[PDB]
RNA sequence: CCCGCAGAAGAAGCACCGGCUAACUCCGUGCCAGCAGCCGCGGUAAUACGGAGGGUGCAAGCGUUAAUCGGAAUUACUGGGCGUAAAGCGCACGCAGGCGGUUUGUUAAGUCAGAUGUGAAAUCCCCGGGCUCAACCUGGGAACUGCAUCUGAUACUGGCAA
RNA sequence: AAUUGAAGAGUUUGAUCAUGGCUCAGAUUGAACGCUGGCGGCAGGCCUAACACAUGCAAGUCGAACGGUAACAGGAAGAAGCUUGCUUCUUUGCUGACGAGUGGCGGACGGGUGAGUAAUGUCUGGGAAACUGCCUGAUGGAGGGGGAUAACUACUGGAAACGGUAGCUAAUACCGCAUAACGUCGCAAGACCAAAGAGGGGGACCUUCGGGCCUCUUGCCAUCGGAUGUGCCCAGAUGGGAUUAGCUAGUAGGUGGGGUAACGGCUCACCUAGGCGACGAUCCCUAGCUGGUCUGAGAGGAUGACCAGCCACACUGGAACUGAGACACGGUCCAGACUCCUACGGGAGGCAGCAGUGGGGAAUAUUGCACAAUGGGCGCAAGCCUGAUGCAGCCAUGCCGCGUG
């Protein structure tokens, strides 16, 4: 079944994840279906640090995708509407 | 029952396929080798990357023969062909590491224990 | 080779024998049908079909011939029998 | 039609085993001159009807044989 | 990452200097020992060998070797040649193939136009953002010069006709 | 805003211009060696022998499917260590838990490699005849029976690997029987197919005090969808050679039978006599393809490590079984090559997973740490597993920064 998860395109000691929808069986940084956000956990308090096209995530969870554990947090941490 | 001119098959991974006996060792004027005796052989034909080349001259112990072997009750074990296992000249002892086809317990010879240990049958 | 799912090896044999028998018995009842068609007996031909239909449909359900494989067989047989029955 | 092909006949002499020539011009990918790159196709035509020299319209069907993935649609012209 | 502590304290090498090519003298040697990417240096004043002083070049690297492309328009499509320098077959006839005067009509394959879809992400590039800088990491664009489908345009080329 | 970028020199001659090779300045490298060598950040690290491999580790998990107790942990009617509340053994699986076994799901992923393959490949663009585990929408299912068996017990053969008898037992193992439509065959009439339970808490009421009953959860069966994955067909493109010009009998097509999840010479029988080929078949040689990488002003030339996609292989040749998926990387079977064990009768094994070793070479690293993160398997969960991964160690191998004042 398809899934929403973090690919780790970071860089030793300063991780920076892509968040992707893909066949759960593939590699954590391998073939995916589409990209649907990102999540810099070193965001720094400056500006940005967790952009996340919700209305797609939506779409796939409609089509049956499961979500990670971390991602699930981020969504319920983006809040949702504000 | 082998003698000079007799061809033999090979019961090991020596690389020799066909050998000839050019001598029956073990006694002046001695005609036959059989059972499990040591013979001197020349190599009539061998595979292309074996432990031995054709034309090589060394010893071997006969381990299978058409004439076979009698046992202390009268029975006989007879083989469809004659086979020997190549040995190194200044040591007897087998040049190969694997043995093929059955052999007889007559080889209980100390120096041929590896030959029984290996080898499928009897 | 040494790893738990040695178990799997011995398992797939239990399975294999199971399916082997039901797989034969099935193609037997299938044979009985093509037999009558080659014979000429339209009745035994229908008689054969009506006893094999369930066991095919049935096997499929159980899943050693899953779906359409059955279908084809019925379809085929049905044509044959009333081709001259 | 989801696309169609034209082409002359080239060979009719075989129980529906019709093969058709197709002709394109193409710019040589290296020296720019335009040359004739021909294509032959093995097409089905039930009850054999075209004849060597006929222009014919053709369409891509599923496999009718190891070789055949095209039936014909219409004929055009004859007695070349 | 931050604060204190001691004391310049632990921390410079390699190739080159005849021309190409940035950098010159002396001593030794004497067609020897030897150098050399190419030219070519060495037989008594060697800026070319070896050493030394000085200098030039690079620096935790520096040289040598190997390897791709470049300069090479030296396989020339863009972008070359064959009288005498490499190169016109000894001559002809001709199949395939390439090319083909001039007119009108038709076709719409080559050609041209538009629309749609597709051209994975990374990479490259532009504008930013984050690690003290940079390498590195990242947002977003741009680009992927391509392919196909549909509809059109008919001057040129191809097809058909006369 | 976003490819807006192009240089020449040395050397045939006494000298010259031309012709023409040789050479040089530049970028680039998974590099090696020689001299030298201070620190850090990111990266790279067997290019050779798809050579051969010692040892550890690289796939398990679920007691909320099942009978269960062998280990250690408690508790227990009751027997006790007794220093009368602190507690010892007989036992008792009573539950916390759990070796072994049955069962379930995963061992088809992740990770390795480039051998074979000039096309069951790859890239581009398309097509019709198919299946699709877990996840998800919809609609109903989930009745009632049966015979087994491992474990275990006894006896017994082996040095070991691992067996032989006889019993004995549970289930989400297995099979009938029912039920059967918007499913399958069928123009129709008709005919035909399925399943499994397990927990959590709970008012009466009460039961053989185990539970019914209520209640929610989770799994189980069927049909049609989705989603994804995969199978298949067409066209173009994707190395070289004529000192290779002819190739082809399942060959090309048809008809029918069979077959596959599916179209199909896929297979067969019979018929037609076709099919390919100088727009390069056949034969031979070499080769995984791509995105892209280097270079070049471009056009090109060269290239396919590291990252991502596809294919292919898993000691060599061949096979199939299980399964939704394999003709299976740490599965099975046969043959082979080769290695290990042995009490000599017989057994066992495959690093192109990680590290490591021998060998080859000019040359390429530690038998490290951790599941903390991310990702994967299983579990309601807690968790367990994870050489994927995240880190660390080694080498100036490269890039970048900095210092040695
Ligand atoms: Mg049929
Ligand atoms: Mg100068
Ligand atoms: Mg010098
Ligand atoms: Mg001097
Ligand atoms: Mg050039
Ligand atoms: Mg010229
Ligand atoms: Mg000349
Ligand atoms: Mg002439
Ligand atoms: Mg004209
Ligand atoms: Mg892209
Ligand atoms: Mg900055
Ligand atoms: Mg015209
Ligand atoms: Mg001169
Ligand atoms: Mg050193
Ligand atoms: Mg257990
Ligand atoms: Mg190869
Ligand atoms: Mg069942
Ligand atoms: Mg029924
Ligand atoms: Mg039941
Ligand atoms: Mg057919
Ligand atoms: Mg150029
Ligand atoms: Mg790798
Ligand atoms: Mg195999
Ligand atoms: Mg199967
Ligand atoms: Mg292995
Ligand atoms: Mg290893
Ligand atoms: Mg060595
Ligand atoms: Mg690793």
From Swiss-Prot, chain A:
Keyword annotations of the record: Endonuclease, Hydrolase, Nuclease, Ribonucleoprotein, Ribosomal protein
Transmembrane domains' residue ranges: none
GO molecular function, one term: structural constituent of ribosome
A Pfam cross-reference name: Ribosomal_S16
Family annotation (PROSITE patterns): RIBOSOMAL_S16
Keyword Ribonucleoprotein set for record: yes
Gene Ontology biological process terms from the UniProt entry: cytoplasmic translation; ribosomal small subunit assembly
Coiled coil, from the record: none
Top-rank lineage group of the source organism: Bacteria
Any one GO CC term of the record: cytoplasm
Keyword Membrane in record: no
Stimuli inducing this protein: Part of the rpsP-rimM-trmD-rplS operon.
Gene3D superfamilies with a match to the protein in the record: 3.30.1320.10
Subunit structure: Part of the 30S ribosomal subunit.
HAMAP family, sorted: Ribosomal_bS16
General function of this protein: In addition to being a ribosomal protein, S16 also has a cation-dependent endonuclease activity.
Family membership noted in the UniProt record: Belongs to the bacterial ribosomal protein bS16 family.
Protein's name in the database: Small ribosomal subunit protein bS16
UniProtKB/Swiss-Prot annotation, chain B:
Keywords assigned by UniProt, alphabetized: Ribonucleoprotein, Ribosomal protein, RNA-binding, rRNA-binding
GO cellular component: cytoplasm; cytosol; cytosolic large ribosomal subunit
PROSITE patterns, per database record: RIBOSOMAL_L14
Annotated GO MF terms: large ribosomal subunit rRNA binding; structural constituent of ribosome
Entry-linked SUPFAM superfamilies: Ribosomal protein L14
Example of a GO biological process term: cytoplasmic translation
Record text on subunit structure and interactions: Part of the 50S ribosomal subunit. Forms a cluster with proteins L3 and L19. Forms two bridges to the 30S subunit in the 70S ribosome, contacting the 16S rRNA. In pre-50S ribosomal subunits interacts with RsfS, which may inhibit association with the 30S subunit.
Record-linked NCBIfam families: rplN_bact (TIGR01067)
Protein name (database record): Large ribosomal subunit protein uL14
Organism: Escherichia coli (strain K12)
UniProtKB/Swiss-Prot annotation, chain C:
Ranges for region Disordered: 1-24
Keyword set includes Ribonucleoprotein: yes
Alphabetical list of Gene3D superfamilies matching this protein: Ribosomal protein S20
Record text on subunit structure and interactions: Part of the 30S ribosomal subunit.
Similarity comment: Belongs to the bacterial ribosomal protein bS20 family.
One Pfam family, short name: Ribosomal_S20p
Organism: Escherichia coli (strain K12)
Cited PANTHER family: 30S RIBOSOMAL PROTEIN S20, SMALL RIBOSOMAL SUBUNIT PROTEIN BS20C
UniProt cross-references to HAMAP family, sorted A to Z: Ribosomal_bS20
Record key words, sorted: Ribonucleoprotein, Ribosomal protein, RNA-binding, rRNA-binding
An example molecular function term from Gene Ontology annotations: structural constituent of ribosome
UniProt protein name: Small ribosomal subunit protein bS20
Function according to Swiss-Prot or TrEMBL: Binds directly to 16S ribosomal RNA.
From Swiss-Prot, chain D:
Signal sequence interval, chain numbering: none
Disulfide cross-links: none
Gene3D superfamilies: Nucleic acid-binding proteins (2.40.50.140)
GO molecular function, one term: structural constituent of ribosome
Gene Ontology BP, a term: ribosomal small subunit assembly
PROSITE patterns in the record: RIBOSOMAL_S17
Entries under InterPro entries matching the protein: NA-bd_OB-fold, Ribosomal_uS17, Ribosomal_uS17_bact/chlr, Ribosomal_uS17_CS
GO CC aspect terms: cytoplasm; cytosolic small ribosomal subunit
Sorted UniProt keywords: Antibiotic resistance, Ribonucleoprotein, Ribosomal protein, RNA-binding, rRNA-binding
Annotated transmembrane regions: none
HAMAP family: Ribosomal_uS17_B
UniProt subunit comment: Part of the 30S ribosomal subunit.
Family per similarity comment: Belongs to the universal ribosomal protein uS17 family.
PANTHER family the UniProt entry points to: 40S RIBOSOMAL PROTEIN S11 FAMILY MEMBER, SMALL RIBOSOMAL SUBUNIT PROTEIN US17M
Function comment: One of the primary rRNA binding proteins, it binds specifically to the 5'-end of 16S ribosomal RNA. Also plays a role in translational accuracy; neamine-resistant ribosomes show reduced neamine-induced misreading in vitro.
Note: The strain missing both S17 and L29 grows very slowly and has a rather unstable temperature-sensitive phenotype.
Protein name: Small ribosomal subunit protein uS17
């Amino acid at each position: 079944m398809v899934t929403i998860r973090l690919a780790r395109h970071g860089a030793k000691k300063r991780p920076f994840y892509q968040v992707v929808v893909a066949d759960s069986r593939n590699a954590r940084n391998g073939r995916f279906i589409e990209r649907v956000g990102f999540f810099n956990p070193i965001a720094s308090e400056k500006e940005e640090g967790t952009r996340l096209d919700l209305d797609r995530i939506a779409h796939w969870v409609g089509q049956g995708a499961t979500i990670s554990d971390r991602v699930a947090a981020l969504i319920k941490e983006v809040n949702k509407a504000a | 029952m082998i003698q000079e001119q007799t061809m033999l098959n090979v019961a090991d991974n020596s690389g020799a396929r066909r050998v000839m006996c050019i001598k029956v060792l073990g006694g002046s004027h001695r005609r036959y080798a059989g059972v499990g005796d040591i013979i001197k052989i020349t190599i009539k034909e061998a595979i292309p990357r074996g432990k031995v080349k054709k034309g090589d001259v060394l010893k071997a112990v006969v381990v299978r023969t058409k004439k076979g072997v009698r046992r202390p009750d009268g029975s006989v074990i007879r083989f469809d062909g004659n086979a020997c296992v190549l040995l190194n000249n200044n040591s007897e002892q087998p040049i190969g590491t694997r043995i093929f086809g059955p052999v007889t317990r007559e080889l209980r010879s100390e120096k041929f224990m590896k030959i029984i240990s290996l080898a499928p049958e009897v | 080779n040494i790893k738990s799912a040695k178990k799997r090896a011995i398992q797939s044999e239990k399975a294999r024998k199971h399916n082997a028998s039901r797989r034969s018995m099935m193609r037997t009842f299938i044979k009985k049908v093509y037999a009558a068609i080659e014979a000429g007996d339209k009745a035994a031909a229908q008689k054969a079909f009506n006893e094999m239909q369930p066991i095919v449909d049935r096997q499929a359900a159980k899943g050693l011939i899953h779906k359409n494989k059955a279908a084809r067989h019925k379809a085929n047989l049905t044509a044959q029998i009333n081709k001259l029955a | 039609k989801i696309r169609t092909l034209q082409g002359r006949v080239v060979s009719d002499k075989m129980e529906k085993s019709i093969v058709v020539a197709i002709e394109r011009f193409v710019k040589h990918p290296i020296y720019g001159k335009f040359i004739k790159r021909t294509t032959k196709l093995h097409v089905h035509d039930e009850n054999n009807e075209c004849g060597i020299g006929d222009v014919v319209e053709i369409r891509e069907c599923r496999p009718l044989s190891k070789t055949k993935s095209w039936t014909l649609v219409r004929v055009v012209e004859k007695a070349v």
